[PDB]
């Protein structure tokens, strides 16, 4: 909710301050393995995991909208961080799938 | 990356530090979703709960296995939403683990 | 020259400014009822679609014909005085334009409205293929923001740096010209704009380990190098010693959002009591802050209504 807080409040004050916000901030996460993939052998077959941490900056874009710009930049963290939880459980889901099915089998 | 979300909320994930290629183009975002994961030239692909694919089999059969995840739940809008706690808990119990 | 006709043209326009009691009504309305309300106003008069892209566009186009047409309607000594005000809205276009040429991205997704540089100047600049040529095309309307650009472009071709040294050099340019065009009303305001900029430069770059003297430029009222250095360490006890200025209200506040909210409300206030000085640039000064702030609240009230956000999240930011 605190990610979106600023996002949704920077849409009709953005679409011409889109340019500004993306400039001061740390440039895009790599599309080829921007995330940190980890391999791990465990029962319930060899399932790979991963954690979503990458650079994106925070409270450091110069110029632009007084409050919103900086608050939107900071918000990128609340994607990253938050995403790690789902990053481990949805991969854990696929592991515990294997077990459950072989068990009842 | 790409986050696959509503047009207006997709907007805020295209900002630097993050890389999004969202927007709705269907009710489960099939139009986009499929084409995009087919290459798997994005570090992460994520599908929200304001779309979420009712046939997950459709995706798996096309991407043909993936060592990177897909369809991570993000809310997809803000309206004070936090029903994605208990919803995800039951999402789990229905398809796997114990019943009710 | 002269503001005699021009002030008069603006006085009729101050009649169709949006009073406080509109935003009061609008919060109580859903998006459907908001849309019926909006259409009564002059921003409503440029409306072209119920949805969000269309609201952003109706607002912008209203600002393009009623506010961005002011520098053309005067010349000379009048025009330089009005121009400095307009220039901030032109810098926003310039920084985005400079960035579309440099990083190779399309013309689109930028701010365009007329002000001091016309639409055609931005198109001819875009299509220019040497940064030096890009710069002469910009220098055609004449303004201090060229002269500011020109010096920075001689030192560097790095995007982030041009952006910062242009802004710093530009407010410094503005200040000297403005002091030489006189009037007490403009001087008091100018002081506040620089003081607000100083505080704000310090906040945006907070904790980057940098020099605090780089965030202080002349034009001040009570702020200095030491307050900046403490502020940079993360200490907000400096704002709690800041009174005798209308930023007395920043005391005991330590959130970036409340702090920055505070500066925009203070600047609004100075300008709104410049109507006891309507002679010369005073009235226009008050008119531009009010059209800008008004436009901002209709965009926030429209966003708040569409996505069903919490009321208090926006009720506080739509009043000073």
Description:
The structure is cut from a larger assembly and holds chains A (about 100 residues), B (about 100 residues) and C (about 325 residues). Chain A is mainly α and about 100 residues long. Chain A contains 4 helices and 2 strands. In chain A, strands 1-2 form a two-stranded antiparallel ribbon. In chain A, about 40% of the residues are buried. Chain B has a single domain, classed as Rossmann fold. Chain B is built from 4 helices and 2 strands. The radius of gyration of chain B is 14 Å and the shape is globular. Chain B has about 100 residues and is mostly helical. The relative contact order of chain B is 0.17. In chain B, about 30% of the residues lie in helices and about 5% in strands. In chain B, strands 1-2 form a two-stranded parallel sheet. Chain C has 3 domains: about 1-75 and about 280-320, Topoisomerase I, Chain A, domain 4, CATH 1.10.132; about 75-180, V-type ATP synthase subunit C domain (V-type ATP synthase subunit C fold, Up-down Bundle), CATH 1.20.1690.10; about 180-280, Up-down Bundle (V-type ATP synthase subunit C fold), CATH 1.20.1690.10. Helix content of chain C is about 60%, strand content about 0%. Chain C contains 14 helices and no strands. Chain C has helices spanning about 5-15, 20-30, 30-40, 50-65, 75-105, 120-125, 130-140, 145-155, 160-180, 185-205, 225-235, 255-270, 280-305, 310-315. The longest helix of chain C has 28 residues, at about 75-105. The relative contact order of chain C is 0.11. The chains are: A mainly alpha (about 100), B mainly alpha (about 100), C mainly alpha (about 325). The interface of A and B includes residues 1 and 5 of A.
CATH topology of the largest domain in chain C: Topoisomerase I, Chain A, domain 4
Gyration radius from CA atoms of chain B, angstroms: 14 Å
How large is the radius of gyration of chain C?
20 Å
Number of strands of chain C: 0
CATH structural architecture of the largest domain in chain C: Orthogonal Bundle
Largest interface: A-B, 45 and 32 residues
**How many domains of chain B?**
1
- The protein's oligomeric status is part of a larger assembly
Strand arrangement, largest sheet of chain B?
Answer: 1-2
Give helix % range of chain C: 55-70%
Structural class of chain B: mainly alpha
User: Would you tell me which CATH topology of chain B applies?
Assistant: Rossmann fold
Name of the top-level CATH class of chain B: Alpha Beta
């Amino acid at each position: 909710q605190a990610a979106k807080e600023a996002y949704a409040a920077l849409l009709l004050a953005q679409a011409f301050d889109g340019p500004e916000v993306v400039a001061g901030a740390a440039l895009g996460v790599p599309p080829l393995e921007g995330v940190e993939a980890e391999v791990e052998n465990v029962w319930g077959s060899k399932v790979p995991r991963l954690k979503a941490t990458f650079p994106d900056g925070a409270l450091l874009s110069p110029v632009g909208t007084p409050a919103y710009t900086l608050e939107a930049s900071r918000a990128f963290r609340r994607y990253a961080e938050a995403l790690i939880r789902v990053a481990n459980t949805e991969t854990r889901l696929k592991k515990i799938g294997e077990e459950i099915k072989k068990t009842t089998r | 990356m790409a986050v696959i979300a509503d047009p207006e909320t997709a907007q805020g994930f295209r900002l630097a530090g993050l890389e999004g290629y969202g927007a709705s183009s269907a009710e489960e975002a099939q139009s986009l979703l499929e084409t995009l994961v087919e290459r798997g030239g994005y570090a992460l692909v994520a599908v929200d709960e304001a779309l979420l694919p009712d046939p997950e089999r459709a995706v798996e059969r096309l991407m043909r296995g993936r060592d990177l995840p897909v369809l991570l739940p993000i809310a997809g809008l803000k309206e004070a939403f936090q029903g994605h706690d208990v919803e995800g808990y039951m999402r789990e119990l229905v398809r796997k683990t114990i019943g009710f | 020259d002269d503001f005699a006709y021009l002030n008069a043209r603006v006085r009729v326009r101050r009649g169709t400014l949006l009073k406080e009691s509109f935003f009061q009504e609008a919060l109580d309305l859903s998006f459907a009822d908001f849309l019926r309300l909006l259409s009564e106003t002059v921003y409503g008069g440029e409306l072209a679609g119920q949805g969000l892209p269309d609201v952003d566009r109706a607002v912008l186009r209203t600002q393009a014909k009623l506010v961005g047409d002011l520098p053309r309607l005067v010349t000379g000594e009048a025009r330089e005085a009005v121009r400095l005000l307009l220039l901030r809205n032109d810098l926003h276009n310039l920084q985005a334009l400079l960035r579309a040429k440099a990083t190779g991205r399309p013309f689109e997704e930028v701010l365009l409205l007329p002000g001091t540089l016309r639409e055609e100047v931005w198109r001819q600049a875009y299509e220019a293929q040497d940064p030096a040529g890009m710069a002469q095309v910009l220098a055609v309307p004449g303004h201090p923001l060229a002269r500011a650009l020109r010096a920075v472009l001689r030192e560097t071709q790095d995007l982030a740096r041009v952006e910062a040294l242009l802004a710093k050099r530009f407010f410094e340019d503005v200040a000297k010209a403005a002091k030489g065009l006189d009037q007490p009303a403009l001087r008091d305001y100018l002081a506040l704009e620089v003081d607000a900029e100083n505080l704000r430069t310090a906040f945006k770059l907070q904790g980057s380990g940098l020099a605090p003297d780089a965030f202080f430029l002349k034009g001040g009222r009570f702020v200095d190098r030491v307050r900046f250095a403490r502020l940079m360490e993360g200490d907000y006890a400096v704002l709690d010693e800041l009174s005798g200025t209308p930023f007395s209200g920043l005391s005991g506040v330590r959130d970036l959002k409340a702090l920055e909210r505070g500066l925009r409300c203070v600047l609004l206030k100075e300008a709104k009591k410049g109507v006891q000085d309507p002679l010369g640039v005073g009235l226009v000064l008050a008119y531009v802050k009010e059209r800008e702030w008004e436009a901002v609240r209709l965009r926030l009230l429209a966003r708040r209504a569409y996505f069903g956000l919490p009321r208090a999240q926006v009720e506080e930011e739509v009043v000073c």
